[PDB]
Amino acid sequence: QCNCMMGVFPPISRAWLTIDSDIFMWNYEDGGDLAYFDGLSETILAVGLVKPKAGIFQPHVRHLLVLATPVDIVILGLSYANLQTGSGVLNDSLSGGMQLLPDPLYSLPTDNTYLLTITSTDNGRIFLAGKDGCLYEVAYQAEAGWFSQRCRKINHSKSSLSFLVPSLLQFTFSEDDPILQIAIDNSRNILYTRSEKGV
Amino acid sequence: QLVRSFLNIKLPAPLPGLQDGEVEGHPVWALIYYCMRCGDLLAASQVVNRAQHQLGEFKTWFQEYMNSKDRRLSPATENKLRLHYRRALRNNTDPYKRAVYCIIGRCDVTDNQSEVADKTEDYLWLKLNQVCFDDDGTSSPQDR
Amino acid sequence: QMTAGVDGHSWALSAIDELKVDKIITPLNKDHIPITDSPVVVQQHMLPPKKFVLLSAQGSLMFHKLRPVDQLRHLLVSNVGGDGEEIERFFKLHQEDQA
Amino acid sequence: TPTQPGSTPRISTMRPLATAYKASTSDYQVISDRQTPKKDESLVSKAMEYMFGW
Amino acid sequence: YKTLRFAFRASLKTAIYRITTTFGEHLNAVQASAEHQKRLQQFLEFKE
Amino acid sequence: SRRQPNISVMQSPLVGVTSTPGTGQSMFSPASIGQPRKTTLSPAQLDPFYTQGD
Amino acid sequence: CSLGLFPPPPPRGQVTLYEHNNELVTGSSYLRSEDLIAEFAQVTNWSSCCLRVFAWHPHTNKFAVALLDDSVRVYNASSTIVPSLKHRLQRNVASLAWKPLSASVLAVACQSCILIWTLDPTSLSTRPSSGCAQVLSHPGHTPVTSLAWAPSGGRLLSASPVDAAIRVWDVSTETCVPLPWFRGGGVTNLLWSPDGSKILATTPSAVFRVWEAQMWTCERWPTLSGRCQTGCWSPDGSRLLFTVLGEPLIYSLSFPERCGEGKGCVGGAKSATIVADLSETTIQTPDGEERLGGEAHSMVWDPSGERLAVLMKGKPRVQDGKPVILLFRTRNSPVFELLPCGIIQGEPGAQPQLITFHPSFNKGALLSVGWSTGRIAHIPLYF
Amino acid sequence: KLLCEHQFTIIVAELQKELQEQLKITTFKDLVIRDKELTGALIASLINCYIRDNAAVDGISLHLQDICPLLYSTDDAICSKANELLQRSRQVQNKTEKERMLRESLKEYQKISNQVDLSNVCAQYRQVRFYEGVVELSLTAAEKKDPQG
């Protein structure tokens, strides 16, 4: 009816498609293990696979799936069927049929900032691209700390003193330059972004 | 445990040709044979239970042989074993796997198992287990 | 340089994951191993033809980058043997030692 | 102009990707939540079970 | 201490019955005297 | 007839503990071979054509 | 789980004969002290039923039956001779419990005492002597409603709704050890876990108490609307199922194992979970709407932990207030599930008065059902 | 590869320490082109694990030959079997068995007798009172030094 987005995640042997609110995944080499998720009620605007921070999840949660809508940022756990700890078997594909958890491991509201790209580092820091020229990050942990939520969103484009600037001076000299792409250098610990207007 | 300890003296190296694998570091058919040669069908039955996944129907035939008074299969299983042995085991690379069948199925009286039986007591013991007293005319005279 | 036709708009384009061979950096050779990786003609035994996937509205388009050894394997098959002028061109392209 | 594809019959191969796992495991280590009958942990009920004991 | 002798006779029968109820028919492989095997069967068959 | 067995546990190995307080050897760092244009330039030097400094 | 997931009850005149392939195969046939026993008896109409109690022996094809005349009868698959137990103190029998690790010992709960019968397992006389009946009693522990032996055979428990202390008995030293708590009511029912490490004790009040068989500690459960009516342990003792009078709900409470030293604490999770609802549903049948739902009066689990039988009692708006047997298929690992299996039904006009499983049936499970006709049925479940 | 599979760090800890430090400074091309004593000592340590912890050396002695197209890796393996039997003879209390295993140990040394430390072997025979093998092996170690007279 309104939206379509299609892509690849190599490190799981699956492609993905979204249709309006819903997401579908299958193996790109055969058409096999076709499976879907219905746990939403709002349009998907961005999708991303994540390599998890160690010790925060259980050993069956090898990957995370991240989704974003106009209103929320949903995080689900990805797992694999019946990979038993034997030996004397060869390397022949991720055919241990893939499973999401039905429980959202975390969710986090958008600010009403529409999000347009999701990615992560080799150390499991999740980064998201906002329409408002913003880089964002999911600063997640395991426990509930006395002054630290289990999960939260942070913005890296809006400098920490920006609340001292009257927004009437922002809505007169700013014009949406959406971050359409993030790229990450885990070989030097550097992050890069590219906007619509090519900044 | 005595037989597994005796195998560290009589089989101090793995022989190329033995079949169906090992238990605790020792060949399944040698562990069965020397438990039977020392009369302990319960010790042999421990090997047959431990190696069930390779032995298959040999566990059910060994348990038939364990539950007659006289170390006998029925004519309805001894002649299954004769028809298996004469197709798959007579010319086998494991001589313990021969000898244990030549005993339990009273077959190939024409073979002395001399890759296992070096001595006159083992020749007597082999042939005495192969004895019948019974005029079952379903037996071929070359096994009798 | 090469081109190929694709049926439908390229909804996606990706590589598939690199096998990389660990550099055995020891107290002896630590100053003598390049931080950069060798070019594919140096690693085309231990590494397979580098794998890729495109998606259109029709499905997956699966392919690989060919190594100089897969280019040689193609010419040995197209000339049905170890001789023919295309193999004699390959030896003039890479030079005789690298060929 | 391109030609359009056709369809009319339908079957099924697709499965759910999320397995309907009937164990509330959101908290992993401790289990159970806002609901249900509950364990007598409190100091006031335990002071009651020395003074009055309803 | 006056009734403790009935406890010893009661616990000994429960101790023998415990072992017959965990090993069951595997006890037929256990080397024992013929009168002890004849009693062990009576503790498998629930006759005591 | 009692063939001198270990009683139950008797052993006395000469290698017991031993210990080594420390050890080391010369580091192998040769200034290449054939010495093209000679071995040193802008560090504290050894082999320039300027054989001076102090 | 919920009643809206069960298959339909069998058509009006058929009887359930057995379970096979997970399907239920059918065919055409196979207060004063006394009102206080009737309030807390395991039998749905103890005051008018011919049959007051049934109990299997914990290892053998022997069973005991208490009748309306305060006989206890004993039956055995290898005896046509049926002993008739009648003592001078045997009155208003409320419970029966065989001793584990013994061929030959049965406990009986009476209005004025406990009777421990000794029965010669080879020489089952039609009426054994009144010397073969050891009497246990304590001032104030009357009537006795329930009896529970420890799995190890060395200890017996008894309950009385009048008495604010469970009585532990050593039947061999003839000692009595009350376990007094500090208010709440007396004791209605008692259930050991199969490990012999835990004990459930229920009361006339909206409180139950779980106990520890090592240090004899007590853990209290007071956030209930009504009384805990019934319950059952899992075969491993790691889970306790229970139901609340006025609530159509099967609760479950978990107890993780003692991977740790140095304290007697009973050790349950901080709350229960809800696992099945028994609310007032319709099911469609060839015979019209049937209506199902009510209150779970008894629950019994198989020794294998794969079949839970639930004796529901309808409200007086649903099947005239008749009792019904629900059969669930259970799983205990990695998750606890209650799946439906079906509805167990008897002779046209019979009502289920009691249910229990056989403890040693080498072919899946075997459900004993006591009917209002005075008939006993034995329904095998093949798995 | 065989040293990695036989738990490596054990076999390297059996070495003399002078070799344990040399092993860190020899490059693979030095070990392949120039060395012999690190490779011989690693084989000797792998075999001393078998002799000490009492596996039969015969199976590892044969595996060391398949991995060689044709090389010296034979007389060290025979000497290792001769030594296995000699060190077992020291613990063996059945006299018949001890004289049997000595009349087996002797036959392994009687193959390789041109390359045997006859002083050490005939001292190690004195340490078991096997003066028979002191006569025999010392003749089989002269006989093959001058096979022409």
Give me some keywords for this one.
part of a larger assembly; 8 chains; D: 54 residues; mainly alpha; 17% helix; rod-shaped; E: 48 residues; 2 helices
Shape of chain E: elongated
Query: Helical content of chain G, roughly?
Result: under 10%
Major sheet size, sense and barrel closure of chain G: 4 strands, antiparallel
What series of H and E elements makes up the topology of chain E? HH
The strand count of chain E comes to 0
Biggest pleated-sheet summary of chain E: none
N-to-C terminal Cα separation of chain E, in Å? 25 Å
Number of helices of chain G: 1
Strand ordering within the main sheet of chain G: 3-4-5-6
The assigned structural class of chain G equals: mainly beta
End-to-end span of chain G in angstroms? 22 Å
Oligomer: part of a larger assembly
User: How much of the polypeptide of chain G forms β-strand, as a percent range?
Assistant: 35-45%
> How large is the count of helical segments of chain E?
2
Of all chain pairs, the largest interface belongs to:
D-G, 21 and 24 residues
Q: Which shape of chain G, going by the Cα principal axes? A: globular
Q: Can you count the beta strands of chain G?
A: 31
How large is the radius of gyration of chain G?
20 Å
- The level of helicity of chain E is 55-70%
Percent in strands of chain E: under 5%
PDB class: transport protein
Keywords: nucleocytoplasmic transport, multiprotein complex, transport protein
Entry title: Human nuclear pore complex (dilated)
Chains A, C, H: Nuclear pore complex protein Nup155
Write a concise synopsis of the structure shown.
With 199 residues, chain A is an all-beta fold. Chain A is 0% helix and 39% strand.
